[PDB]
Amino acid sequence: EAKHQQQFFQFRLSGQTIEVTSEYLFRHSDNELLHWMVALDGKPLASGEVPLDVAPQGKQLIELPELPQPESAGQLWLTVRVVQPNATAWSEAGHISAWQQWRLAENLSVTLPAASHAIPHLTTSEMDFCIELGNKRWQFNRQSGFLSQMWIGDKKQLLTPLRDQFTRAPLDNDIGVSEATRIDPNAWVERWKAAGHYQAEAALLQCTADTLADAVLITTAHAWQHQGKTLFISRKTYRIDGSGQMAITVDVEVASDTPHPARIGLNCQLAQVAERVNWLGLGPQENYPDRLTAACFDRWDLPLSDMYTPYVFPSENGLRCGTRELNYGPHQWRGDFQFNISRYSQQQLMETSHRHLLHAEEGTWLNIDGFHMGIGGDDSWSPSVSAEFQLSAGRYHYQLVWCQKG
Amino acid sequence: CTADTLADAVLITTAHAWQHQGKTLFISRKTYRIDGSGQMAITVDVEVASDTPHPARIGLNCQLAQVAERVNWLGLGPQENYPDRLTAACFDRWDLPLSDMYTPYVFPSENGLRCGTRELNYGPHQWRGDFQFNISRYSQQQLMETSHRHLLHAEEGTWLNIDGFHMGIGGDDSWSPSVSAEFQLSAGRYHYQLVWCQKG
């Protein structure tokens, strides 16, 4: 993020014209090459290289050729980057010094899904709702109101039920100088603890299941109360269609007098451990709502080890924002969300003092958030999350689609 | 457009696309849930293309057959207010005659909006949610085509515009775009819910 904000080349896009302004005061851009690329949802469509001839503090206007205009659905992204072909005393040949990304043109998807002939079958007991479709099967706990288990064939997919999460392992900016002796009431973590966000217990309000003409509809409503006070209300809809897909719509109400929650999303512990994490979204590196400018939208494939940031004092980490599709093993999650995936739960990160004491858990912990609070950074002893990055709207909606390899 | 009977309600699902010259501008997915108590829950999800200019509003409109004398709502301000001109407004229960819900600007335009409204009552109809509304006898089409306010004529019924989201108004100057980025509808995806009930 520091490298991107400190670039010596600034970029402006106007139609098909890229304006490059040099921030150098003395040198001419004699070791600079501009590589541009246009991709559609991570699929490259066109590319080109233009040498840079910019005087100190000057501007070079670069007219792109006729860019591709795909009729397939998706967003067009234009990425430029400055490459140094020759090695310097402080850098090697091929060094990238500056980059920028834009959205070019989006074709909204209007095509309907294929008319699947099958219908998921719903069985009702006193303890659970069971939806069965082919080899796949879902189970909803009627006492808890959460999806408890999913089976592909005879293999369980979950170790922990899929539940709403409103907290994160506190960052160093969340803690401040709030020691166990000199408590800091203004610290974010102290306000969350005093409000009971870490101790709030979910209470089921309603849970119904209806069979549609082509799907199965599951509706749940939970209330998170702490000492006779409702902090959050979550209303969730599960739509299991005949194609195997699972659409999850979540509507959340947050009390205005409680401190703004750190996140609004779901979490679960997947039984499967996989080697690669593939997602279509922002950046190869971890990024957050107020630290995502350096990240780029593309198709990224990383090993699961690179999805975890080894901070000395464990905390919430590894978040990727602006993600439209996430693939892990046989599971695919689509929507507009942020996620982090690792072998350590948020509970373990909160209780472990140093990273060398962290131990991997049995499965994979996945946190998918519709919304996430920004991180601080102006200082580390006082609250420094700006108002535009706090979760203060009061009402929140997000949708998720969960499908499999079929 | 599908209709399903639930255990206690009737579910209506629709999806529309707004296209102009071979290009989809907006997609609206709407859900209607008519329960046994008489209530009508309407959930709207809207997709806006990123390359099209940001829309001025995202909501619904209809012409009610009934004309009533008083407009009662629980929301912001007695006077008209907009996303970037609502600081002076106050949240309370307001009751105004329908005439005061229209602002007589010399050159007709969109007017009379009330923001931050949780409940709106007009005749036997009640609308609940988190929305902005304007109510008057002139349609948005008539306001666009009428040069001066003295040429405005009331229509047969009442025109109601309920918006989940609304673009801010300018004011820094009148010759150049002056709506700030935080008041433009640039999110791309929008959701809002409405409940429509009656006197029962």
**DSSP state letters, chain B:** -EEEE-SSEEEEEEEEEEESSS-EEEEEEEEEEEETTS-EEEEEEEEE-SSSPPPSEEEEEEEES---SEEEEEEE-SS---TTS-SS--EEEEEEEGGGGS---SS--S---EEEEEEEEETTEEEEEEEEEEEESS-HHHHHH-SSGGG----SSEEEEEEEEEPPP--S-SSS----GGGS--SSEEEEEEEEE---
Q: State whether B24 and A75 contact (CB < 8 Å).
A: no
| Gap between the Cα atoms of A212 and A130, Å rounded | 15
Helix, strand or coil, per DSSP, at residue A154: coil
Give SS3 for A395.
Answer: strand
Q: What is the C-alpha to C-alpha distance for residues A286 and A340, in angstroms, rounded to an integer?
A: 9
A116 near A243, Cβ under 8 Å? yes
Q: Name the residue among A105, A208, A217 with its Cβ closest to that of B51.
A: A105
Find, in chain A, the residue whose alpha carbon is nearest to that of B16: A110
Q: Enter the tokens of residue A169.
A: 């392992």
Mutating which of A40, A103, A106, A108 best tests the B interface, going by the most B Cβ atoms within 10 A?
A108
Query: What are all long-range contacts of A122-130, with beta carbons under 8 Å and residues at least 24 apart?
Result: A122/A209, A122/A211, A122/A216, A124/A209, A129/A207, A129/A209, A129/A218
Three-state DSSP class for A119?
A: coil
Please choose, from the candidates A315, A306, A308, the residue with its C-alpha nearest in 3D space to the C-alpha of residue A352: A315
Report the SS3 class of residue A293: coil
- Which residues in chain B are closer than 8 Å to A217, comparing Cβ atoms? 6, 11
Q: Is B84 left (phi over 0), alpha (psi -120 to 50) or beta?
A: alpha
Query: What's the CA gap between A144 and A137, in Å, rounded?
Result: 18
Give the distance from CA A177 to its chain's centroid.
Answer: 29
CA distance B200 to chain A (A): 24
Rounded to an integer, what is the distance from CA A105 to the centroid of its chain?
23
**Closest alpha carbon within chain B to A214:** B4
Residue of B nearest to A109 (CA): B24
Contacts of B41 in chain A (CB under 8 A): none
Instruction: Quote the minimal CA–CA distance from B102 to chain A in Å.
Output: 29
Beta carbons of A268 and A161 less than 8 angstroms apart: yes
Nearest CA in chain B to A395: B130
Cross-chain residue pair B7–A210, CB shorter than 8 Å: yes
In Å, how far is B15's CA from the nearest CA of chain A?
A: 9
d(CA A329, CA A338): 18
Beta-carbon count within 10 A of B83 CB: 20
Please calculate the CA angle A347-A351-A357 and round it to the nearest 5 degrees.
Answer: 110
Interchain CB distance below 8 Å, B24 and A336: no
> What are the structural domain ranges in chain A?
7-112, 113-405
- Tell if the CB–CB gap between A108 and B49 is shorter than 8 Å: yes
Concatenated DSSP letters of A186-209: TSHHHHHHHHTTTT-EEEEEEEEE
* CA-angle at A321, arms to A296 and B58, nearest 5°: 100
Residues of chain A with a CB closer than 8 angstroms to some CB in chain B: 75, 103-108, 110, 208, 210, 212-213, 217, 251, 336, 388, 395, 397, 399
Tell me how far CA of residue A199 lies from CA of A2, A33, A225, A226, in angstroms. 37, 55, 9, 7
Q: How far is A236 from chain B (nearest CA, A)?
A: 13
List beta partners, residue B4: B11
**Which residue of B128, B189, B190 is the best one to mutate when testing the A interface, meaning the one whose CB has the most A CBs within 10 A?**
B189
Residues of chain A positioned with their CB less than 8 A from the CB of B191: 397
As a dihedral over the C-alpha atoms of residue A282, residue A287, residue A288, residue A291, rounded to 10 degrees, the angle is: -100
Tokens representing B74?
């629980």
CB atoms within 10 A of CB B192: 22
Which amino acids of B are annotated as binding site for substrate, given as ranges? 175
**Among B6, B27, B189, beta carbon nearest to A210:** B6
What is the 8-class DSSP label of residue A256? S
Report the residue of chain B nearest A210, measured CA to CA: B6
The answer to whether the CB of B189 falls within 8 A of the CB of B45 is yes
Q: Are A60 and A52 in contact, with CB atoms under 8 Å apart?
A: yes
CB contact under 8 A, B24 and A107: yes
Measured CA to CA, the distance from residue A287 to residue A339 in angstroms comes to 10
In one-letter notation, the amino acid at residue A185 is P
Residues of A within 8 A of B6 (CB-CB) are: 210, 217
The span from the CA of B16 to the CA of B26, in Å, is: 8
Q: d(Cα B183, Cα A316) in Å, to the nearest integer?
A: 32
Set of chain B residues whose Cβ sits within 8 Å of the Cβ of A212: 4, 11
Length of chain B: 200
Contact A213 B47 (CB under 8 A): no
B7–A75 C-beta distance less than 8 A: no
Interface-testing mutation among B11, B50, B54, B192, with chain A (most A C-beta atoms within 10 A): B50
SS3 category, A350: helix
- Structural determination approach: cryo-EM
B139 vs A295: CA distance, rounded Å: 46
Dihedral sign computed on CA atoms, order B101, B104, B110, B114: negative
- CA of A339 vs chain B CAs: smallest distance (Å): 19
Alpha-carbon span A380 to A92, nearest angstrom: 36
B6·A217 Cβ contact <8 A: yes
H helices of A1-65, where?
2-5
Whether B47 sits inside 8 A of A108 (CB atoms) is yes
Q: Are A363 and A273 in contact (CB under 8 A)?
A: yes
Q: Which residues pair with A130 in a beta bridge?
A: A123, A139
Per-residue DSSP letters for B26-42? EEEEEEEEEETTS-EEE
The whole-angstrom distance between A390's CA and the closest CA on chain B is 15
Distance CA A369, CA A396 (A): 11
Beta strands in A52-190 (DSSP E): 59-63, 74-84, 95-107, 121-124, 128-133, 136-141, 147-152, 155-156, 158-165
Residue numbers in the known binding site of B are 175
| CB-count burial class (<10 Å; 0-12, 13-18, 19+) for A315 | buried
State how far the Cα of B111 lies from the Cα of B139, in Å rounded to an integer: 11
Chain B: which residues have CB within 8 Å of chain A?
Answer: 2, 4, 6-7, 11, 17, 24, 27, 45, 47, 49-51, 130, 182, 189, 191, 193
Nearest residue of chain B to residue A218 (CA atoms): B6
* Residue with the two structure tokens 């109809």: B125
**Residue type, position A42, single letter:** G
Given in angstroms, what resolution was this structure solved at? 2.2
**CA neighbor of B158 nearest in space, from B197, B117, B198, B101:** B101
Residue with tokens 């402006």: A12
| Chain A residues touching residue B4 (CB < 8 angstroms) | 212-213
Kindly identify which residue of chain A lies nearest to residue B191, measuring between CA atoms. A397
